[PDB]
């Protein structure tokens, strides 16, 4: 409840990007987190492609998890994966 940010589109231009994870935190992020708590962890990460039982190797889940979440917080966020710049 405020009126110092919700008024002109000028302030909406600086609040249209996802800094932490608010971007997908609603639709995608939740649908990704097997916990739906708002935070994904390797242990849960694998459960994504694991339950798929296709032809993947959990070995890539750890090399992908580490490369994804650079915050080394042990937990990956929507804003931690997007950090990927200059590819
Ligand atoms: Ca979780
Ligand atoms: Ca993190």
Domain ranges (residues) in the chain: 8-83
Contacts of 71 (CB under 8 A, 6+ apart): 77, 80
What is the Cα–Cα distance from 7 to 20, expressed in whole angstroms? 23
Cα–Cα nearest to 84, from 72, 64, 67, 66: 67
Phi, psi of 76 (to 5 degrees): -90, 140
Cα–Cα nearest to 79, from 44, 42, 40: 40
Question: How many Cα neighbours within 13 Å face the side chain of 68?
Answer: 17
Q: Which residues are annotated as a binding site for Ca(2+)?
A: 33, 35, 37, 39, 44, 69, 71, 73, 75, 80
What is the Cα–Cα distance from 40 to 65, expressed in whole angstroms? 10
CATH for 8-83? 1.10.238.10
Question: How many Cα neighbours within 13 Å face the side chain of 27?
Answer: 1
Instruction: State which approach was used to obtain the coordinates.
Output: NMR
Q: How many CB atoms lie within 10 A of CB 78?
A: 21
Q: How far is the CA of 3 from the centre of ligand 2 (A)?
A: 31
Phi, psi of 20 (to 5 degrees): -90, -65
Consecutive H or E run containing 30: helix 28-32
């Amino acid at each position: 409840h405020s009126s110092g940010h919700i008024d002109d589109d000028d302030k909406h231009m600086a609040e249209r990007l996802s800094e932490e994870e608010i971007g997908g935190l609603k639709e995608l992020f939740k649908m990704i987190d097997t916990d739906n708590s708002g935070t994904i962890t390797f242990d849960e990460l694998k459960d994504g492609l694991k339950r798929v039982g296709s032809e993947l190797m959990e070995s890539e889940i750890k090399d992908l998890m580490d490369a994804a979440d650079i915050d080394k917080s042990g937990t990956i966020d929507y804003g931690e994966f997007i950090a990927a710049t200059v590819h």
